[PDB]
Amino acid sequence: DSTTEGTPADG
Amino acid sequence: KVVKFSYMWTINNFSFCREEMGEVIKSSTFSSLKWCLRVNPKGLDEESKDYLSLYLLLVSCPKSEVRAKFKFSILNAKGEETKAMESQRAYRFVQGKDWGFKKFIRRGFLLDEANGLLPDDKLTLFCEVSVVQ
Amino acid sequence: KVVKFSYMWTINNFSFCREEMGEVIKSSTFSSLKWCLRVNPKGLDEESKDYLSLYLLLVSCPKSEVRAKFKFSILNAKGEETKAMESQRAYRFVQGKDWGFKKFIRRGFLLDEANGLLPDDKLTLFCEVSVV
Ligand SMILES: [Zn+2]
Ligand SMILES: [Zn+2]
Ligand SMILES: [Zn+2]
C-alpha cells in the first residue's frame, strides 16, 4: 500500500 | 549491490491515544539514503480505522534506481520478532514515495495487554529493508 | 491565500545541446521572490538516464521558506500544453532549493521530430507556480 499517487517531486 | 539494514522504532506510552484516525507519527530518519517510518495508530482512513497502518518512506534523492523489499515486525518483551508482515516483492522507491501496509495490525489486538506486545506500554517496531541496485 | 504565476521558456537549437548527464541549463529569473527553471538535457543522474530533468529553483527569498505547488508542461506547435507533470501538493522551498522531476520526459521522445514537440528545433516549456 502507498499513501500517495501521482508524481512525487525530487530535489 | 545488495544493502540490507534495519531500524528499531520504540513508541512509548502507546496506549495514550492522542492520534485520531488519519493522524500520523513519523520516526526519526535512518540509513544503512535517508528513510523514515510513518504510523497511523488509528488507521490511514475509515476502511482501516481499526488497524495501525505502517509505512516506509524514502526521504532522500537516490542517484540510481532503488528497489527494496521490506519487513515490519513487532518485538515482544524478549526482543523476538512477532506478527511480521513482509512485502511480496521489491517495490520501487523514488524520493518521497512510501510503501507499507494499511492494515498492519489490529488495534484491539495490540492494545490488549494479555497479548504481551506493549510491555511497559511501549510499542517496539522493527523494520528490515533489503535494497537492491 | 494563493499567488499564481507562470513562466514560458524557449530553448533554441535544442537538438544541439552538448550538455552531458548532470550538466544543466538555467533560465532567466522570473517572479509573480525570484525563481528560475533548470533543465538537465541528458538527465540529472543514472536513475534519470535518457530523460530530460526539469526543476523549479527558488533563486532569492527574503524569508526562511516558501511553500509552492508547481506544474510543468511542454507547449506544442499550436501552443497547447502537453506532457504535463505536477507536484500535486506544495513543497517547501528555501533560497537555493530546487524541486522538480528528474524523469520529466524521455529524451528519445522529445528529440524525435515526428512527435512534433521541437518545432524549428525549439523546446518550449511552461511552468505554473502557485505560492500557497
Ligand atoms: Zn532528485
Ligand atoms: Zn529479522
Ligand atoms: Zn496552464
The residue range of the domain holding B53 is: 2-133
Q: What is the CATH number of the domain that holds B8?
A: 2.60.210.10
Helix H or strand E encompassing C110: helix C107-110
Helix H or strand E encompassing B56: strand B51-58
The three cell numbers of residue C55 are 526543476
The answer to whether C22 touches C47, Cβ cutoff 8 Å, is no
**Gap between the Cα atoms of C8 and C20, Å rounded:** 24
DSSP-assigned letter for residue B27: P
B95 and A CB contact within 8 Å: yes
Query: How many structural domains compose chain B?
Result: 1
Across the interface, whether the CB atoms of A11 and C101 are under 8 A apart is answered no
**Interface with B, mutate which of C46, C47, C91 (most B CBs under 10 A):** C47
C50 and B CB contact within 8 Å: no
SS3 content of chain C, % helix, strand, coil (to 5): 10, 50, 40
The three cell numbers of residue C61 are 527569498
**Gap between the Cα atoms of C22 and C19, Å rounded:** 8
**What resolution in angstroms does the PDB record give?**
1.4
The answer to whether C84 touches C73, Cβ cutoff 8 Å, is yes
SS3 content of chain A, % helix, strand, coil (to 5): 0, 10, 90
**Gap between the Cα atoms of C6 and C129, Å rounded:** 6
**Gap between the Cα atoms of B114 and B117, Å rounded:** 8
Contacting residues for C80 by C-beta, under 8 A, at least 6 apart = none
* Experimental method reported for this structure: X-ray
The answer to whether B99 touches B9, Cβ cutoff 8 Å, is no
